[PDB]
Amino acid sequence: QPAALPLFQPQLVQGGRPDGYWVEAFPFRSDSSKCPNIIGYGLGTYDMKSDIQMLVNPYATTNNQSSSWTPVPLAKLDFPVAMHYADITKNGFNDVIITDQYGSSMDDIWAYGGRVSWLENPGELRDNWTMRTIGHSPGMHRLKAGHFTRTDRVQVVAVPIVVASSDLTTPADVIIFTAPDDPRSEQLWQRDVVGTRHLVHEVAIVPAAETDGEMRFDQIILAGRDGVDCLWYDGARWQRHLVGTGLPEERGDPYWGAGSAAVGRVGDDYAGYICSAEAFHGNTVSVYTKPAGSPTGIVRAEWTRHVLDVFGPLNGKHTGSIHQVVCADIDGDGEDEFLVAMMGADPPDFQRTGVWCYKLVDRTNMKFSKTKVSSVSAGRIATANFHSQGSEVDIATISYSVPGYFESPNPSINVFLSTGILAERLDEEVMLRVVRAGSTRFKTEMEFLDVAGKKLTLVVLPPFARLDVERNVSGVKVMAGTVCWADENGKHERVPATRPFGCESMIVSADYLESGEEGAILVLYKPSSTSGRPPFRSMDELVAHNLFPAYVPDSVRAMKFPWVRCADRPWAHGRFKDLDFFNLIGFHVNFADDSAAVLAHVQLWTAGIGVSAGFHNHVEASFCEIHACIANGTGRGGMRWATVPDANFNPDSPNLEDTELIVVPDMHEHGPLWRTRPDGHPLLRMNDTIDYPWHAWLAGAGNPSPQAFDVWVAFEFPGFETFSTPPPPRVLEPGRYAIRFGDPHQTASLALQKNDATDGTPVLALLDLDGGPSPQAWNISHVPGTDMYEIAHAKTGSLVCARWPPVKNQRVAGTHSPAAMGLTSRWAVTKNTKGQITFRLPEAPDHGPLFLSVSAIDAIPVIVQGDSIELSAWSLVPAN
Amino acid sequence: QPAALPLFQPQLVQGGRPDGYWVEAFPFRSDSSKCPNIIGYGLGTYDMKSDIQMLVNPYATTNNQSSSWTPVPLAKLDFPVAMHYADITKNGFNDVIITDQYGSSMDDIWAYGGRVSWLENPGELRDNWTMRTIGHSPGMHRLKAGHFTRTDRVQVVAVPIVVASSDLTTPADVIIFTAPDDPRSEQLWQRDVVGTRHLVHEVAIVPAAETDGEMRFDQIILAGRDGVDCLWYDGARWQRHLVGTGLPEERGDPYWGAGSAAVGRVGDDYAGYICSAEAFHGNTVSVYTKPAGSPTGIVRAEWTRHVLDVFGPLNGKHTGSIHQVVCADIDGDGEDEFLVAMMGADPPDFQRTGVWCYKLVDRTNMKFSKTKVSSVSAGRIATANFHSQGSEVDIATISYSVPGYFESPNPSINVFLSTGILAERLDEEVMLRVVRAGSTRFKTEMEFLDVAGKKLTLVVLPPFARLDVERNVSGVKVMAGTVCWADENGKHERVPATRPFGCESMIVSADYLESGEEGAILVLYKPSSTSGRPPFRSMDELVAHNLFPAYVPDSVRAMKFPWVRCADRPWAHGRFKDLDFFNLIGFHVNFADDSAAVLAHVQLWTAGIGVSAGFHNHVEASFCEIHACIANGTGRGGMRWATVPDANFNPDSPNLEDTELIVVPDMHEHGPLWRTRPDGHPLLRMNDTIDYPWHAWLAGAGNPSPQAFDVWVAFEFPGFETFSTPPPPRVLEPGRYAIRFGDPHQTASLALQKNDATDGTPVLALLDLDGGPSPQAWNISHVPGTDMYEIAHAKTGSLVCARWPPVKNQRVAGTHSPAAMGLTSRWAVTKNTKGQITFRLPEAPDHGPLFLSVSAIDAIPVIVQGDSIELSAWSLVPAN
Ligand SMILES: O=C1CO[C@H](CO)[C@@H](O)[C@@H]1O
Ligand SMILES: O=C1CO[C@H](CO)[C@@H](O)[C@@H]1O
Ligand SMILES: O=C1CO[C@H](CO)[C@@H](O)[C@@H]1O
Ligand SMILES: O=C1CO[C@H](CO)[C@@H](O)[C@@H]1O
Ligand SMILES: [Mg+2]
Ligand SMILES: [Mg+2]
Ligand SMILES: [Zn+2]
Ligand SMILES: [Zn+2]
């Protein structure tokens, strides 16, 4: 399933900065690289030195309460430009390498400038690290650290853009610096010039480790006027591989070739593609591709350049808006997207301000599409997981601001935090916007409420994702998809709602669980010691606490969730006076996509001993409701429903003996209580409300003291199809099959007319001409929380589905536009004593059972009919 | 109807400031006071002077494209503290009055300091205004400008907090300064000391104009150690009126009394209440009240102090978190809420960080409740309409940050913009979160899309609100509530959906329209010249443009809305190939409240000549859909629906003669097309989908060139009850009535048992004992877009409603918890040739017509029955 972009909670790392040029992700220790810091700064001015401020990552430490990024001044430098880092001292701390003394601009280059230097990490978070000089070369513009001719030392490649003021035509030395055995002695680093290039504006590095053995040394990618270029060493010699020339020169315009270039991973190949921005500070985005079946990596292939976008014209000084391109697996599917850092433009224009995120949509043809991620100036981009231990990629940017050239307003640093859940305050209640679990490749955990001895945590899971829980203590309640675990009694599974009137324990009994093909969205009930211990004798004992992560907006963090006694709620209207009966609100969960559709509404309730939460039937508003009890004060509290008809039951003086009880014990959820058609569509009232019998929560009877409160969580789902009444036997495993009709000799198979993907393509029985048309393949699968199945074309995906309306003799077709709740594309299965299978639609109350059937005994068309048992028997051969 | 709080779009006015203390709303001109600027600053330090930066309001000019607040340095001052403004030069520009030279703290008071000075407004937006000295007094802490002993000159009241370092016990002069005839000559201002007070920490002013003639001069309110105090002049003498003492002193604690105080308007009274914060920088909120029926204003009443909140303990230097209280009609109901500026606390704590907004909930008892508006440090608050011409009140804050005392992170200025609509990007589509029109007191306009020669503008209206439109050009489509206009043919009205299969012009033919009792939420189609002119020959001609206001978030502002050809849409699946048939998405409108409920989903469509948007029936997803056509390319395009049953119609090769057509001309909307029960509940399919016959948009037939596109807007509503089939006659005006049964002598009336507000109170016929029980009153009103009515108790509000379920002989009760779509609380009316009225429920298909009826011929109970015509006749007398 194509990977979806994740969501992005923005957060302001540093604001109102004087200026801004550079931002980098800085892992303090060089061993590990999760939750790094950010280092950022600007080019400074003649009046004021630039503070290279290292901002501390607050999420760097778990148990985090801060969102604030603490600024540590690493140093104070005359026009710094570029930087990188590596463990120079070989002590497991990262040391900063930085160039400075550039000049104020390319027409103000410092003759004795372009200094390259390293800042020694002292192992703690004091400011002002001892600085040392690596070396000088006028115009010094970019550098990277790695192992280029030797592995047993830190080496630095450094490259001036020009050598002197306004001189755009003299090329610069590509320089390599080498650590001594003892970098702590103030002395000059060994240097080599390894080529001369014109107007190099970016250096990119491909570590030896990423090349899956191809290269023992680090590869240098240079984006310049000469274009995009690859230099590498092999042990004996330097060689060069031209990737391309980039922008063709125009007359009068000193800039051509490239300003930035990055190497994209695709699958097993670390160089699936090289992306590029042209020229120096240009407006042109392009990508170099190589022919299908090329060798892995850069140098063994010939590269061709295709232009993707030109974001509009250049100004009189022949510049534009693109400062950088970088590569990163944003959506976490194993292919690298690339991000374009937009400086902003003049006049102002959002098309040219922010980050564009390009996604490789078609691997064969190398087609891309761009989405907008952020629309506030990006002078530089840095990527890294900035908030968790998993492999999400967050995006940090610094605003591009240089006085006397181009200034954006409120020059700042913000980071955009990858997440599959977002939290927004409405008023008293909260909005949890969620990704479709189906198409994320990321696990997301967000704690929200600490109540009744439990930490309520909203959790999204990618397909086939594992959640490591606490055996027998942890509990779950699935809201979308399915989860699964196994102990001594085999496999167990949890779906949005169990069997009508059933009861299921929420306690995971294994050390971990796993999500279904469709992933899962769930509430994990974690054990908490900060919210009391049952039994609960008072509401003061059940105070709940606001648990949202430091990185959620403040208005959400500042919210309290009091328990309000139902009698006092605005919707009470004189009702529930004198009842220890309380209610806590509340948490909307809705999909973050363009449907904005509801997943569930959640709120909470408590009942003292002898208390009835009142009988009702939900005529006021439409929902399929499932309760999960957390604490059962008496061991005997649960749900009652009336067995007599609605007319026959007085809700006010309720006769409990026209009622049946389901104890919902500690950490259990119960099955649906609403009325349902035989195959599990709900009954509907005249005002479009899920039809329910009279029902209520009743707490255990007896002495109100000592007190002992029931605590339960309401789950208000929109309509769906549940299980069948009565439950069919299980006569079919899902799997890929051929679906066939007939006997020993004369047989035919179910088929999608000319294998055609279009909605409304006919479905047929194709005679098995022993000439060799070959029987088509069908994927059959169970629908979770039902007793129904669907049949989907192995090849197109098309669902076997009766055309509208499902009556005696309707034609059958393939569709990707099924009706709500699978009304015409889900089937009840039987199996005769022969072994034949039958497929039936949700029975409507007028038309009888209608089966998937042939119509005779060239292609026979397919229909649903009720009349003949013979036409509807099918033999299932396993296919592939 | 109680007024709801409006919504707040936050916006960052200035960030990453060094420090922060003061913020003020500064009207550049002194004539007008809409869209003022903001002036703000901090106390500065010994190293750096404080820039009193005046930030330009970008919304100050209409046709605004900027959100950025341009900083103008007004001056650069040694420890400024407080400020105000007034037109000193009498030239219609506001001049700034400011104190500075305070000292660094109360233990570092400047002996020759406390300077008071004015900055001359030069009539333009250059920086650095000529400064002049008004006068000095050590410790100078607060001041206000007004007319206190004379009207023909600007006067300034100024008050030191202390007179010298750490001296907390010597009180200070309350000083009055007077402009000369010629303030432009550098000379000293005339001064008077008008009293001495202890630790005055706030000055508040009550202009002569607000006192409705009571006071010819301005009233001075002082919050200090002596408490909250009122000094005023009358022409001859000063007098003083003690409002209260405030915090009672504790031993060892130099602070008591008050730190801030503000005067709240209530209705016709400008001093309904005085609110207060205690003590100096304290944690205590209280309010002074006066006895019901007191005279208006402050000095003619005796004031009593009630404590509302104590936000937690004090630190060792006996301080807390509250810096200021102010008053403002936030919700616009004619009563002033008050806001508390929270500095933040230590350790950090949101309860003490931000603004609390208190609302006077009960005028009689003077009860308040607080809501949280913002949760980022507020050192000072300023209120003013910062973005429109109406009377919404926005909230600006500056962070409280003083180094070496208390520092919050990212000291900045933000403003919170009052609005009833909020705009949030989802992905390709937009979320428009809206207030309930019913309970706002503000008109809100937000343009979103410029398309087909129209500016599509979302509009919320308070009840009985007027929208001034362009006669015959402007158009409207109501999504909630009702609008109304009148021309020569009388009154016209527009509701969410007109009569099934009808057609209504959207063109307002008057110069204005007005909203209904329930207000309205609508799309106003404004005339645009930036989006082309019909007829539309190409899609390039119908490019639409993103119109959201500069104050909406950036991601929303940066969005494009392309027209995508339906064939290429993801949901297309081989369908609509080769059809000039396009689609633009999209705009969710949802209520901003805790229900988060849908109002409508909106998207757009176009069809070339001879094009059918395809036949369908909405089995895929549930909605009540209404289309509004903007441009009809042929004059003949519209909606077709099948008249044969669903089985009888082949959607693929559609036989147009089993179809009927409704031309939806230019600027018209049509009536519902879905199937409906006789009183207008929709028919529902087995999968809970609004049941529709086969239907489609078909463009006019004939020559595809010249081209000519239909352009229409889809409105996807959730289920509701529409009009009745067939339409009943109008036999009843709404109004207040007594509802009576019988004949000449023996009569009884409909009544709510013991006038009791509780849900499920019985409804009865009370014998009219001529002793004098007196007949109860009932409000009867039409339900918009239906042909039904409801009966609501004049006194409680309780709806006359049959208990569940509505069958032969059901009991009738009063409720505020009605069922969805009024299923049991809405009535079809008849009137016999006598004049008697009958009330019938939405007829269910089993039980017959059930009428509101008595049950005999002490109180007779009330029921719904079908059997007897006699028991159900009612006589309606007008009541009051
Ligand atoms: O579109 C949908 C399909 O399945 C989900 C649950 O698993 C629904 O809640 C959602 O609205
Ligand atoms: O079933 C339920 C739904 O709403 C009821 C309100 O009285 C609750 O008591 C209970 O959670
Ligand atoms: O609660 C509601 C009542 O009326 C509105 C329209 O006027 C609805 O759309 C809304 O969902
Ligand atoms: O009635 C409608 C709803 O969806 C259809 C999609 O083909 C549109 O053509 C038309 O706006
Ligand atoms: Mg090191
Ligand atoms: Mg003036
Ligand atoms: Zn990816
Ligand atoms: Zn108000």
Residue B275: strand pairing partners: B262, B287
As a whole number of angstroms, the distance between CA A432 and CA A423 comes to 5
Tokens of A427: 């008023």
Q: CB-based contacts of B225: which residues, under 8 Å, 6+ apart?
A: B197, B198, B199, B255, B256, B257, B258, B279, B280
Q: In what order do the strands lie in the sheet with A202-206?
A: A202-206, A219-224, A227-233, A238-244
CB environment A552-588: b (16+ within 10 A), e (fewer): bbbbbbbbebebbbbeeeeebbebbeebbbbbbbbbb
As a whole number of angstroms, the distance between CA A777 and CA A877 comes to 10
As a whole number of angstroms, the distance between CA A860 and CA A876 comes to 18
Q: CB-based contacts of B764: which residues, under 8 Å, 6+ apart?
A: B750, B751, B752, B753, B859, B860, B861, B862
- Residues framing ligand 1 (Cβ under 6 A): A 480-481, 496, 597, 599
- What separation, in Å, do the N-terminal and C-terminal C-alpha atoms of chain B show? 19
Do B177 and B145 form a contact (C-beta atoms < 8 A)? no
Q: What dihedral angle (degrees, nearest 10) is formed by the CA atoms of B20, B23, B28, B30?
A: -150
DSSP letter for each residue of A797-855: -PEEEEPSS--TTEEEEEESSPPGGGTTT-BEEEE-SS--EEEEPPPPSSS---EEE-S
As a whole number of angstroms, the distance between CA A594 and CA A374 comes to 18
Q: CB-based contacts of A471: which residues, under 8 Å, 6+ apart?
A: A508, A509, A510, A511
For Cα atoms A197, A203, A205, give the angle at the middle one, nearest 5 degrees.
125
As a whole number of angstroms, the distance between CA A210 and CA A216 comes to 10
For ligand 3, say whether the CB of B599 is within 6 Å of any of its atoms: yes
For ligand 2, say whether the CB of A697 is within 6 Å of any of its atoms: yes
Beta strands in B581-699 (DSSP E): 581-591, 598-607, 624-631, 638-642, 659-663, 668-670, 695-698
Distance from chain centroid for Cα A603: 26
Report which residue type is found at A803: R
- Quickly count helices (H) and strands (E) in chain B: 1, 62
A155-160 and A140-146: which strand pairing?
A: antiparallel
Q: Does the active-site annotation cover B387?
A: no
Sign of CA dihedral B69, B74, B78, B81: negative
Residue of chain B nearest A720, judged by CA positions: B687
Top mutation candidate among B522, B590, B591 for ligand 3, by most atoms within 8 Å of CB: B591
> Is A863 in a helix, a strand, or coil?
strand
Do A520 and A482 form a contact (C-beta atoms < 8 A)? yes
As a whole number of angstroms, the distance between CA A673 and CA A624 comes to 9
Tokens of B3: 């007024």
Peptide bond into A535 cis (omega under 30): yes
Give the count of beta carbons closer than 10 Å to the beta carbon of residue A300: 12
Among A676, A689, A596, which residue's Cα sits nearest to residue B721? Answer: A689
Tokens of A830: 């039987």
As a whole number of angstroms, the distance between CA B148 and CA B155 comes to 7
Task: Give φ, ψ of A460 to 5 degrees.
Answer: -100, 135
Phi-psi region of A254 (alpha: psi -120 to 50; beta: other; left: phi over 0): alpha
Do A319 and A282 form a contact (C-beta atoms < 8 A)? yes
Q: After which residues is chain A broken (C to N over 2.5 A)?
A: 857
As a whole number of angstroms, the distance between CA B688 and CA B692 comes to 12
Do the Cβ atoms of A646 and B804 come within 8 Å? yes
Give the count of beta carbons closer than 10 Å to the beta carbon of residue B660: 13
Peptide bond into B347 cis (omega under 30): yes
Among A829, A828, A826, A823, which residue's Cα sits nearest to residue A805? Answer: A823
Query: Which positions in chain A touch B815 (Cβ < 8 Å)?
Result: 573
> Is B60 in a helix, a strand, or coil?
helix
Name the CA radius of gyration of chain B, rounded.
Answer: 33
Report which residue type is found at A518: E
Task: Give φ, ψ of A509 to 5 degrees.
Answer: -100, 0
Cα distances from B844 to residues A540, B823, B849, in angstroms, run 48, 10, 8
Do the Cβ atoms of B619 and A686 come within 8 Å? no
As a whole number of angstroms, the distance between CA B414 and CA B40 comes to 11
- Residues framing ligand 4 (Cβ under 6 A): B 605, 613-614, 616, 625, 697, 714
For ligand 2, say whether the CB of A587 is within 6 Å of any of its atoms: no
3-state per-residue secondary structure call for A641-691 = EECCCHHHCCCCCCCHHHEEEEECCCCEEECCCCCECCCCCECECCCCCEC
B219-224 and B83-86: which strand pairing?
A: unpaired
Do A256 and A171 form a contact (C-beta atoms < 8 A)? no
Among A393, A508, A387, which residue's Cα sits nearest to residue A61? Answer: A387
As a whole number of angstroms, the distance between CA A14 and CA A427 comes to 29
Q: B473: distance to nearest CA of chain A, Å?
A: 32
As a whole number of angstroms, the distance between CA A525 and CA B471 comes to 61
Do the Cβ atoms of A820 and B410 come within 8 Å? no
Do A862 and A855 form a contact (C-beta atoms < 8 A)? yes
Give the count of beta carbons closer than 10 Å to the beta carbon of residue B745: 6
For Cα atoms B280, B281, B287, give the angle at the middle one, nearest 5 degrees.
70
Q: CB-based contacts of A288: which residues, under 8 Å, 6+ apart?
A: A228, A243, A244, A273, A274, A275, A276, A303, A304, A305, A306
Residue showing tokens 């909120």:
B285
Report which residue type is found at B262: A
Give, as one character, the DSSP assignment of residue B512. Answer: E
Cα distances from A721 to residues A497, A680, A724, A826, in angstroms, run 10, 5, 9, 10
Element (H, E) at A874: none
Tokens of B267: 């209705």
A581-591 and A430-434: which strand pairing?
A: parallel
Cα distances from A739 to residues A219, A765, A877, in angstroms, run 55, 9, 7
> Is B755 in a helix, a strand, or coil?
helix
Highest CATH level, class, for A722-880: mainly beta
Among A120, A125, A56, which residue's Cα sits nearest to residue A87? Answer: A120
As a whole number of angstroms, the distance between CA B233 and CA B216 comes to 9
Query: Which positions in chain A touch B804 (Cβ < 8 Å)?
Result: 617, 619, 646, 651
DSSP letter for each residue of A385-417: --S-SSS--EEEEE--BBTTTB--SS--EEEEE
Among A389, A383, A390, which residue's Cα sits nearest to residue A324? Answer: A383
Q: CB-based contacts of B77: which residues, under 8 Å, 6+ apart?
A: B44, B49, B50, B52, B98, B100, B101
Among A333, A367, A579, which residue's Cα sits nearest to residue A439? Answer: A333
For Cα atoms A57, A59, A60, give the angle at the middle one, nearest 5 degrees.
65
Do B118 and B81 form a contact (C-beta atoms < 8 A)? no
Phi-psi region of B303 (alpha: psi -120 to 50; beta: other; left: phi over 0): beta
Residue showing tokens 């204005």:
B512
- Quickly count helices (H) and strands (E) in chain A: 1, 62
As a whole number of angstroms, the distance between CA A130 and CA A184 comes to 10
Do the Cβ atoms of B426 and A596 come within 8 Å? yes
Tokens of B179: 């402009």
As a whole number of angstroms, the distance between CA A345 and CA A353 comes to 7
Do B420 and B37 form a contact (C-beta atoms < 8 A)? no
Cα distances from A760 to residues A78, A372, A821, B309, in angstroms, run 70, 35, 18, 67
Give the count of beta carbons closer than 10 Å to the beta carbon of residue A628: 22
As a whole number of angstroms, the distance between CA B119 and CA B86 comes to 10
Q: Is residue A737 exposed (0-12), middle (13-18) or buried (19+ Cβ within 10 Å)?
A: buried
Report which residue type is found at B443: K
Residue showing tokens 């407080």:
B82
Residue showing tokens 């300091």:
B113
Give, as one character, the DSSP assignment of residue B681. Answer: P
Tokens of A605: 């309730």
Give the count of beta carbons closer than 10 Å to the beta carbon of residue A384: 23
Sign of CA dihedral A523, A525, A528, A534: positive
Give the count of beta carbons closer than 10 Å to the beta carbon of residue A734: 12
Do A498 and A521 form a contact (C-beta atoms < 8 A)? no
As a whole number of angstroms, the distance between CA B814 and CA B801 comes to 6
Do B206 and B264 form a contact (C-beta atoms < 8 A)? no
To test the contact with chain B by mutation, choose from A573, A619, A646 the residue with the greatest count of B C-beta atoms within 10 A, namely A573
Q: Is residue A286 exposed (0-12), middle (13-18) or buried (19+ Cβ within 10 Å)?
A: buried
Question: Minimum-distance ligand to the CA of B607?
Answer: 4
- As a residue count, chain A comes to 880
Report which residue type is found at B274: I
B430-434 and B581-591: which strand pairing?
A: parallel
Does domain B421-721 match CATH 3.30.1120.10? no
Do B20 and B412 form a contact (C-beta atoms < 8 A)? yes
* CATH 2.60.120.990 domain locations along chain A: 421-721
For ligand 3, say whether the CB of B624 is within 6 Å of any of its atoms: no
Tokens of A215: 């290269």
Do B19 and B409 form a contact (C-beta atoms < 8 A)? no
Beta strands in B512-636 (DSSP E): 512-527, 545-546, 564-565, 581-591, 598-607, 624-631
3-state per-residue secondary structure call for A235-251 = CCCEEEEEEECCECCCC
Distance from chain centroid for Cα A4: 7
Give the count of beta carbons closer than 10 Å to the beta carbon of residue A313: 8
Q: CB-based contacts of A102: which residues, under 8 Å, 6+ apart?
A: A43, A79, A80, A81, A109, A110, A113, A114, A139, A140, A141
DSSP letter for each residue of A79-96: S---EEEE-SSSSSB-EE
Do B516 and B466 form a contact (C-beta atoms < 8 A)? no
* CATH 2.80.10.50 domain locations along chain B: 722-880
Tokens of B827: 């009535």
For chain A, what percentages of helix, strand and coil (3-state, to nearest 5) are there? 5, 45, 50
Top mutation candidate among A593, A599, A717 for ligand 1, by most atoms within 8 Å of CB: A599
